[PDB]
Amino acid sequence: YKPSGNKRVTFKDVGGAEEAIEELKEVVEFLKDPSKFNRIGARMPKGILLVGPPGTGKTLLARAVAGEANVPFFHISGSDFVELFVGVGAARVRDLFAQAKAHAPCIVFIDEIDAVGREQTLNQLLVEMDGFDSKEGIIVMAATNRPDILDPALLRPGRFDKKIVVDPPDMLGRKKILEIHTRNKPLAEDVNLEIIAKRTPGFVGADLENLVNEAALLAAREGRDKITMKDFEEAIDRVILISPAEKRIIAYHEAGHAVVSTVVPNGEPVHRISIIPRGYKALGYTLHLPEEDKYLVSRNELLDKLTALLGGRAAEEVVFGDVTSGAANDIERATEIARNMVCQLGMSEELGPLAWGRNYSEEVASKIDEEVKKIVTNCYERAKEIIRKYRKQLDNIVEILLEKETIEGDELRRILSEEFE
Amino acid sequence: YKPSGNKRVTFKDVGGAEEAIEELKEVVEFLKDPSKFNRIGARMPKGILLVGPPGTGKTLLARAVAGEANVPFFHISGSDFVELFVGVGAARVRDLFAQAKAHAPCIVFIDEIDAVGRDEREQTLNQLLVEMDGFDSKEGIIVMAATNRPDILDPALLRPGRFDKKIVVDPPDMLGRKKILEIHTRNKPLAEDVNLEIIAKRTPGFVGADLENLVNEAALLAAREGRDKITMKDFEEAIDRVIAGPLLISPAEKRIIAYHEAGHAVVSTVVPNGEPVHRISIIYLVSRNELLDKLTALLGGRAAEEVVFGDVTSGAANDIERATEIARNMVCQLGMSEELGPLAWGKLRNYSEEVASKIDEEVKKIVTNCYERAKEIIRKYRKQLDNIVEILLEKETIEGDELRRILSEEF
Amino acid sequence: YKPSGNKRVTFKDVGGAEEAIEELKEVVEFLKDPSKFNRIGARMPKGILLVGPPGTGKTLLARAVAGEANVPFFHISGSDFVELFVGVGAARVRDLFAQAKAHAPCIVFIDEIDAVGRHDEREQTLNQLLVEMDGFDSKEGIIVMAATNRPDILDPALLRPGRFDKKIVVDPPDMLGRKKILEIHTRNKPLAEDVNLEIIAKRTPGFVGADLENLVNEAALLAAREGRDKITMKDFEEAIDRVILISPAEKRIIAYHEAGHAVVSTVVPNGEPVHRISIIKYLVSRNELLDKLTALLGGRAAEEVVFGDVTSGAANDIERATEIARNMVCQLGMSEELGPLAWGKLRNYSEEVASKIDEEVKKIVTNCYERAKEIIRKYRKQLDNIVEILLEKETIEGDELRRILS
Amino acid sequence: YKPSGNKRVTFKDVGGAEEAIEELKEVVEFLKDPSKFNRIGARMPKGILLVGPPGTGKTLLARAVAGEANVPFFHISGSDFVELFVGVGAARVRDLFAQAKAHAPCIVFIDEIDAVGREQTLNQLLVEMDGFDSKEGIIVMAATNRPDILDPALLRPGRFDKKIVVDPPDMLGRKKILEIHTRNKPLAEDVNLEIIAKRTPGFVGADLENLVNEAALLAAREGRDKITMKDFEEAIDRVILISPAEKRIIAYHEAGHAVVSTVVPNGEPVHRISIIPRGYKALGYTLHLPEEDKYLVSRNELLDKLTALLGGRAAEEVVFGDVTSGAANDIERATEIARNMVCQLGMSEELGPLAWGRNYSEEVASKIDEEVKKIVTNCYERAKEIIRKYRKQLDNIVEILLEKETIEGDELRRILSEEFE
């Protein structure tokens, strides 16, 4: 394999991710001279996971880090390994790392890392991660919008043991991204990117770069030498949000996750809750992440986890009397877990300490289904029992959420303790 | 591979395709003077996919764009590459693009692209991909492709950088038929009794290719009788000819489709969560009730047919399919079933026959409830249903601040 | 490449190809006076492909068009161009079109066009053809006709609009057509007054024009051989054995099967008008489909009623009919009990539903079957009459059939 | 494709098939100068099917015919077309014939013709057969040891409308084949091929050529310049028949086919019966051949045909009280036919005029099975009823069969009429 011949980027070229750039500044410092860290035992991560929705500059930042450190950048895409013949995947992972070490210090980027990190190909990856010497100035960055799908072996210490969340940009972030992608473009005097930032809720960087291109097409179509405000207004429409009653439901869903995870004894600590459309900081997402601290999980831990996953839906049903599609992913994950308890873990009553999996009769298929349904239904009703018992808290957390949108650190811990002290 | 030696056409030659022509105007300007775009980095697509039924003018539009830009037009048929010996297809694609670059700007147009882009075909298609990726848009080359079989295409073909822009070419309605008849009648001697509106109205289902043939058959009728003008009777009789030569919508059928279309519109309007209805023509997160409303509306066409005609036709097949998809999704994915619980059933089926059976009863129950509700709505609003149909038959299309008001004056 | 110096033929010389003659009459009008079409923009085809087995009159037809219009005829054979030195074929095609333009209006006829219109010098030769077709002005009254019994061998470039985009199918003659062919080839011969050409048509199923001409000739040689000045019926009867199949029992059966489809189609309110029987919409409603299904089952219905035994003949129909029923039940929501639901598409539903679908499909097909049988029994006599005519002539027209259903 | 560069053979090189060579002598005469036939309207076949077990010189004779006429020979193998991508099969059939015509007169040989003649590939074959002009000196020969598997469209007149049966060789045929393959070999004086012919019952030409090679290996192994009798004796053993009580059963099976086919009204005329191990002249084989005369078949014709197919087994059961494996192929063919009556032809009581085929429920699967079983069982019991009623005839036919081995022409017709007059 042969390093990217693409155009070098820096952080100059990345808008609306000042938090991410902050954390990555050390990695740039490391790459520029690892010997400053090495000399005093400052141990950097070997793997850094970038998490966010597509088109949010995950790949961009990886490249910005390499250009900023003026180091080679290897771009691989996870979806290139799936579908490969027997062994070809692992041999490419081998080669990748052999090239990385020959060109160290360097960045190795693996896009769509979920594509490989859901056997041989991933096992080879894990051995390479642990096989290489951080001190040689090698850092592997990976991107995913599906971190819930990842093998927890990937996130073990000594691997991708740090991650950074790249969120969609708000109005101020959108404006900046507009300015970046308009730098070398000829704008009319009447163009106001502020109004365009305001009128593009939900748009990510990729969409905004596109909108800018659509705007340029509109000018060029008419043979014009400057892009007008009308061209930007018009372009938005070519590429085409949340109601205050939908905001409410989303808030109740997220609060529901939070309340149930707090009450349930083996609940996952709640560090942040958020009602940003697709922020991956929300707890709703978090609850779908693979267990990275432990290696064993107990039946009661799973039932507690399952009950937390169904908290979103429990809160909607209790409060609104009906349910939306919001909980589809929660339903799917909860079902997966229960099927796994029954068919792999030997955690059903009736089915016994047996691996079922298809290898078995309709008669067993049927008991499996009954058993899986029982677990999920029982956890769901437990969730609602909890919601109802802690309705006032649920209501309180919603109220703040509607106001603040995202609650994160020491502040969140004040609120939860006030509320469940 | 050589550019076409046939007659240069322009948009003056295309009828009833105004929306497609407006999307294509950009391409015409780019080709006239790429510098205007390249100058300000207005990135054009490399490949444009034209999608529509046969004889609707896909090839014509591709030609019109080249003619309008006064650039060479390469006319290729996907069907030529299939059946070819080992490697001959790839080598042809390679050559094809070699010539395009030597003639740039130009249009390369691949008809029947689903013939190539559905061993050897792999290599042929792989080679297509390579050439698409391999050419510089800035150099004024546009590849257009046509298909009436888009679902059969490899998604690799639709990736960004490839055929990532699609334009839909629709069958003409009354006024479009009328325009196409006028285009193909420009240079022909017509009797004073000929009325192309009436012939527009009498040829619902006809595409541009059908109408051009119609005109010629009319002409052949006059010629056979040695007459120096084409008469209305010639056109009328030509209709019956084009038919039995090689699909007209019958008047009775027109009626049924009108009621089907009026039905969707009536139900959509009554149902609280109905989708606004912008047009009727003869030619993040959702709630349970949003979905039941959607489903009920989707079943309105069939509901109208059943209530008005008693019988039901094949016309609601696509809507039944969609309605059923929605209800399986509700039962199997969203946990919106009475009895089956907040469980994901499926993902391919990983459950017992006992469950499969309950799923079927629950899907059938949802769809059947929405169906009966649709019928109640149609019976309750039969008068307005009938008024919309009457107008829709007169015009074939109702739209805009005219459909806007009709639904108010009625509801 | 000069106008053929062979005998003038007209349509009077072509037997049993009325449909194709009717398609070609406009070509003749055009050749006689192109200006009639030219002046109103009536565009004629540049290429007409005649498709059919050897000896059916493809060449004869082309010659008759020219003789009929009194216009020159250039006869070329595609098999001449195979095997040629480098370039020679293209140059011949160039010259051939140069000659047609000098002599227009005219017919240029290419026999065995598959021999050229099919991997080397043929490319060159074929490409020149495509160029010349594209190059010539139709309005000049030039028409190129081609013949093949091998149309699937043909390069589709040839069949594209502006080229050979009109195909005329030429079939083996039915009994009346064979009779006419015999008249034609007998015009100039001394026949005895005992010669019954109809009986000879009847006894010669499967014979094509070339076969029947040969037979007349063998009859003539037979009489001459015996020093006789008239050709008798015995000569023709003996000739048949010389120029040389389906059981008459099997023929009966096929005839009842076909007549059955036709009676049911006619009787059933939504059936498809019958245009022809031979023993060789956008939307569709529930009733229309049931009527169609019933009609599809008529052949078999006619066998069961008439013969009590059924043959493998209805296999395709049974398949078709079952396809329709399954689609009614599974895609069209036209079942009693199964609702306005799509079941399937492969199978996305339970065994309980699988089994209900089979009951319902079975019930529809069976009901339509019984109904077909009722129609057959009710119209037995006319069924019998139709079969009696069908067996005699091999091919009857709808108008005739509806008439018998008096 | 490019004509065989293999070594030219003549009939000189083919042993123990004097009957086959006789029939093929005309084809040689035709190929040498088709104009002698053409001139007086002598119409040759366009297709000639060679039938026999493998290793019996089917391919050999095809090549002998071409070498004898000194004409080009195209060898194709049917199994080369199956497994090919979409269209490649038909395009190769096209090309084959295009080459044949360019090199006419010539022989086109299609080995393992059953491999293609059981859609597009066979349909193309049929059009080529009917597309070519016999008078151009083109004859297509085909070989198969599975003619029961062939599409009856192949055997229609104007195609493979003549066939020749090549049987295993008896002792005298075996001796000749031994002599041919020993011509250029150095034999000891003590070698007696006669005794070797006698001791190799069941051996075909291919086996005998092999035995000869094994004999040569034994000499060469010991460094010897002549092949000894001991070497031949020894070689037989390296490559390794019927009991007089098995002969009896085979005779009763074949007689059973004959008796039932005679009695049953729509029975297939019986032209020969044989108890040669694998002669394809036997009626047992014949009854498995595809209907080549007709196009329609009636329910009663099939029931009669089914009953005849089961006559072999019926005779064994009636006479010996039990049954052997001999009837496996008959059972399989009879089942095929009944399944076809029920599922395709609309010839069941209960199932109706419906195409079943899987497209259908377990409930229907089950009725199908019941229906198919009913037909076969009813036909089987009919067969036995017939055997018992005509036991004396059955006994008589066996007796002759045991004596004569094969009964063929006018003689067979005497016997059957005496017996069922």
Ligand SMILES: Nc1ncnc2c1ncn2[C@@H]1O[C@H](COP(=O)(O)OP(=O)(O)O)[C@@H](O)[C@H]1O
């Ligand atoms: N934060 C950002 N600031 C400026 N441009 C951005 C940003 N995010 C995305 N873009 C632009 O849009 C594209 C986003 O694609 P990518 O970097 O692959 O995002 P992701 O990896 O999240 O899918 C980039 O190529 C970049 O040009």
Ligand SMILES: Nc1ncnc2c1ncn2[C@@H]1O[C@H](COP(=O)(O)OP(=O)(O)O)[C@@H](O)[C@H]1O
């Ligand atoms: N929209 C139209 N306006 C005018 N003529 C049309 C139109 N559509 C088709 N035609 C006539 O019929 C022909 C249709 O062929 P084509 O453009 O190949 O349609 P498609 O490519 O969609 O199959 C055209 O060449 C033209 O003569």
Ligand SMILES: Nc1ncnc2c1ncn2[C@@H]1O[C@H](COP(=O)(O)OP(=O)(O)O)[C@@H](O)[C@H]1O
């Ligand atoms: N339909 C027909 N009517 C009269 N004669 C015919 C007919 N078809 C064939 N023949 C006779 O047989 C001869 C050979 O037929 P030909 O025209 O060469 O048929 P094709 O071109 O289909 O091979 C003709 O010249 C003609 O004399």
Ligand SMILES: Nc1ncnc2c1ncn2[C@@H]1O[C@H](COP(=O)(O)OP(=O)(O)O)[C@@H](O)[C@H]1O
């Ligand atoms: N009748 C025979 N006479 C002489 N040799 C034979 C005979 N039959 C087969 N052989 C030899 O053994 C081989 C038999 O193979 P082959 O001709 O393919 O038979 P088949 O086509 O029946 O399988 C031949 O190559 C030939 O050398």
Ligand SMILES: [Mg+2]
């Ligand atoms: Mg992405």
Ligand SMILES: [Mg+2]
């Ligand atoms: Mg088209």
Ligand SMILES: [Mg+2]
């Ligand atoms: Mg001919």
Ligand SMILES: [Mg+2]
């Ligand atoms: Mg063999």
Ligand SMILES: [Zn+2]
């Ligand atoms: Zn959630």
Ligand SMILES: [Zn+2]
């Ligand atoms: Zn609809």
Ligand SMILES: [Zn+2]
């Ligand atoms: Zn039929």
Ligand SMILES: [Zn+2]
């Ligand atoms: Zn047997």
